Symmetry: C5
């Protein structure tokens, strides 16, 4: 579930449905599951989503997913939106994926398609998205690749013209497992997007690098206390430049026969500076953050959620569970 992955701070060691859309070899290592994320139909948060994964024999896995929305697309559309507020997100997200085991190497591929339009004279919107993700794994080595083919969103209504177009989206990840407890990974991500607000052309170009590590402090059953160090440098051309060292630690515990408790804390240690270009001014604010969540188990049914009141520290009837998901494991 999304809440499960968030409560563990995107630990990069977590095996989940939501973490396999970019690592499709994990669809072979997962179990047969059906998953639904609670939410609404329009452009609301959270959005309704759902899918399934099944095994074709004993060496293949196939499945589909409804309503997934990209982050690189929704973020750019949101950026252009408040700068015209009728530009469109991914309309009918369609994800197909497949994975097989060729000997000792498992490999997988996921495909994403989306299309929607509105031809009313007062609402001139249309949106199209497409991309693929290919990954192969060995158990000791790990390789992933994410490619975006097309991305577009136009609004031509009543003398107002707006567009956002994806000019490329690359995402390469390499992982190495020195042991079944410790692993090291690296990542390079380029993203060039160009938009027209009303004859005004704007172009952004994002470059990211990532080197990390995930280990285990407490080696136990019931739960494992995990910890991770990471170095991240993000360069946005002619806008800003960042360099962070996020350190996180957390645990996932089978508290009861009906409860799973997830918690983590993170903070950028020593390195938290985001220098702003064309000015030279830096920014080093507080960055300590936490996430908490619960998973209620009824045999083959699990309701993952996050504690709604963790941010204020308060948990009561009015703030109990938010970001709910349901999973059925055949």
């Amino acid at each position: 579930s999304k809440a499960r992955v968030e409560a563990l701070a995107n630990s990069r060691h977590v095996l989940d449905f939501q973490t396999a859309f970019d690592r499709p070899y994990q669809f072979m290592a997962l179990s047969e599951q059906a998953t639904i994320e609670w939410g609404n139909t329009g452009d609301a948060n959270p959005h309704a989503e759902g899918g399934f994964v099944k095994r074709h024999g004993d060496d293949s896995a196939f499945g589909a997913y409804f309503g997934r929305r990209s982050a690189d697309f929704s973020e750019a559309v949101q950026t252009v939106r408040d700068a015209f507020a009728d530009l469109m997100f991914e309309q009918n997200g369609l994800n197909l994926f497949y994975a097989s085991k060729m000997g000792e190497w498992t490999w997988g591929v996921t495909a994403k398609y989306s299309n929607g339009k509105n031809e009313d004279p007062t609402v001139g919107t249309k949106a199209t998205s497409a991309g693929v993700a290919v990954a192969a794994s060995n158990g000791t080595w790990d390789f992933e690749l994410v490619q975006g083919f097309t991305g577009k969103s136009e609004l031509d209504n009543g003398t107002v013209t707006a567009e956002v177009e994806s000019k490329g989206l690359t995402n390469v990840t390499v992982g190495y497992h020195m042991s079944p407890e410790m692993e090291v990974y690296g990542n390079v991500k380029m993203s060039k997007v160009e938009a027209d607000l009303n004859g005004t052309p704007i172009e952004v170009e994002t470059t990211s690098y990532k080197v990390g590590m995930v280990n285990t402090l407490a080696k136990s059953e019931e739960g494992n206390f995990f910890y991770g160090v990471e170095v991240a440098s993000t360069k946005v051309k002619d806008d800003s430049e960042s360099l962070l060292l996020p350190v996180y630690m957390g645990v996932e515990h089978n508290a009861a026969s009906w409860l799973v408790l997830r918690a983590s804390v993170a903070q950028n240690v020593i390195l938290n500076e985001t220098k702003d270009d064309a000015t030279g001014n830096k920014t080093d604010e507080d960055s300590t953050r936490m996430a908490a969540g619960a998973g209620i188990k009824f045999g083959k049914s699990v309701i993952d959620a996050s504690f709604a009141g963790s941010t204020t520290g308060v948990i009561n009837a009015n703030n109990l569970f938010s970001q709910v998901a349901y999973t059925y494991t055949f």
Copy 2:
């Protein structure tokens, strides 16, 4: 209940008391039970309803229902209401529902009769509203036939200042269902409806014809858990401006979570075919279509309380948003 079937995407494989009204042969296969839908009297949502079904012998069933309202009648009355001069047009007042079913050899068949009559003769409301109909269906384990015919329906308003009438000029619904496997089925139906209205001397005609073909496959269905999915092609045409070809693809599960809990969830989308054209021009609309529904039923033996998670559309389970659309069922 209206929440058990809504949480299960209104599938054609579900057998409830709320599905047996248009499939009267299903009252013989339903367990003897009494249902109460919680709500308030009058133009309220949700409305209050309830009924029963009892077996008269070894091959027969009968019962009655209270307060059930028609979707087409309500839709027509609502579309006429939004024309404040005519926000008194009445709904289906009261509402009586009788049904009967039997087993003639290997074919089981059933009938369902609907009636309604309301009146408000005060000189400043002048409202009157009536309705009637019938639904006949027969079914062997393999072949399923359903015909729905609405004889009449009216809603007149006359308060000495304005006048509004809505009339049903025809409503027929025929469905065919085939069962290859006890876990696979196909169906198709035709829906024809004509509504005549008059808003203070402005005669209006509304005509709708619908087609739909489909499949419901229940893969991985056990005695503790039932996974299913279905595909369907639905075409709908309004005489003047509306043609819509859609491909609804849904999936969902009903799981016996515990001895006191049953969890139901579903997700649906319009895959590829999500197009609705307007006839006046050639304006086509392809907007978002992902939706989900969740619900639960608390089992206390012969008593079950079914509801829908109120926070489903916001994704929250708290005590301020816990249950909605509650109904109480008692299995004799």
Copy 3:
């Protein structure tokens, strides 16, 4: 409790403390118990009430009850009250007191219930008085029931420095018969008369109301954890020079011992076919929607039971801001 009787559709088969006030032979069939209805003081809904019933020997019962307010008295005061609320001080019953006795004379159970109420406010600003008295006599054979209710007096006065308004009951009869052909089948009939006169600064108001009722109560499903009842009734009403009504309410409901700590009750009713109310001068008619439902739960703790009604009954919502209302507490000895 009031909640329990409400969620069972004021069915004439439910034996409860609240149904035995007008059927005083039923106090010999109840167990020994003490009940407290939650509420506040004054003209507040729900009002505070409570009382007990104890067995005196083995063939007699007795008890008392605090705070019971009539329906006719409250209604008659309310119509004048809501007539610039110049008459907003008219007092309802002030301090209710009931004394009931029941004895088993041979095979016939018999019982009497007495009602007294009195209160006043002699402040010149608020010159209010209120008095009421009545009795209820009933007997039962097991198959034959006879119940008689009489209102000896009832009056509510108000004399400010400016206004002057009083209401007064000039009679209130309520004869009722009942036959039991089977432990599931029973039929009954009821005749009711009520004259009310009011004064509004010298303008008399008169209200005469006559009622007739015939109905039956039967069982569609018999169990041991919970039976299943239904009823059909014919109700005719004639408010002199105002309105006339004939109705056919039909109800159906259930009480189920869901667990060892739970009792679930629900019901639904509607006036089938015969829904009709006619005005007298205009001659007009009204036949609108009449589908009502009632739900409630009783939490059992052994000798203590908390009876409530689901507050989300009219909205279909069992949330926490809306879980239990109309709470009452009953201690059974």
Copy 4:
């Protein structure tokens, strides 16, 4: 617990920590326990309170209590507050010390109350003080109780207005008899006198009251006891008011489960409800029926007593679950 005593209609048959302040011979019957009342600091409601009682040997008991406030002091200060006078002090830092011993066949106890506080800032200028003792003895069939307030004051020198409330007497004699372990009869005489200087306008009240009553148990059980009680109470306020009442109550405290106690009661003034005004002769007789309820969550040697917050509106919902919470630990 205050919620426990209120839910049971303040009857004289209840043995609670809160009923032993005015009957200090009960501190030897109570088990060794510590009580904390949830609340805030200051002129709040409820107020924070806490104390303990411990056994000193085999026939003695002692303890202390924090934050207790007197009903008469609060009422006298409130009467002046609601009639630039909203800064009058209540009892501040109230201290109670008690002791009890068994003198052969008799049990006797003493409690002492002290409360001092001040605020000498020029724009407030308030000072409050209090003192009193309560001596009681009991045998098992006879109860003798005497409460004697020694001092009580609340001044106010705002620099623009002046005020001062003073106690000029307090007397509470109470004799109780036990016609049986079940039945019990009591009597009570109370005298009080409060003198105030409302910016140069001397206001004086003089309260005289007598109570005769009984408490009886008509249903006997080992899970819970059902009780009722009748009482005649006369109250006279010199040159102002006169009231005669007959408050009748009934109630029960039941151990429903191994983790739950349930308390409920109902009361009403029967036949005698008249309050006569001694300035015009006009009387008053309105509605008296009242109810209270509460619960206790027994988690072993830890019990949390509370009152159902929705009793007045008859709603047990999550926004109106519990109120007047108090935690009790038994050593």
Copy 5:
């Protein structure tokens, strides 16, 4: 858990993560664990914090903590904000490193603290640096704790106004003696000077404290333990005020069930409660009664410590169940 140490009135007898922060010899006596304190990021209350403690052998221990904020800093910056000046920076990205070791018969330990932040944006222009250490030792009967602060600057230079705070010293020495496992005494001296500059106008604050007190257990039990303590506190703010208090408290922590722990306490300033102004000479004696409650839900190795939100009003309802929640996972 902050809400635990708060429900026990910050008693010296408790062993927790923060009590170990200021007494590093306790990290060797703490069980291996990791704790996360729920909250938000930035100048928010509660703040998000978390850390762990692991054993390096059989006689050593170490760990780290994220997001801890010192109270002296959070009070000086707050009073400067209360005197525009709303952008003054609190402690940013607080880091804590601890080491403990059972050297011989002694058990020492050291805690280090560091924090740094900035905004360098011309219309905020903020900066906040902090550094300090804490050394302690204990052989079982004698405790020696020392707390020293090195840097405490916190600036603000936007276009118009110019604020500034600085710490010119912070020393805290405490000595404790343990006569029995139950009774303990302690003495503590703290001297801290804070010099601010509010837009050229200089402000100087000097504080000196002297605390001496005892902690004993009134009742003795296995699941719970009823404790109490008496303390004398004097505080002389140079040429601003002078106080002398006597805080007395009592409380308990009960293993109510296998899934529940209940904690509560009550406190008051008995007899000595005075605060005298240095210039005017006036004194204030106001109400000082207070209580605290909290719960800990045990799930085996995971414990959810919370503070009863409705304690200050005496309610337990939907909106007032838990607050100040933290999560602890014991390895």
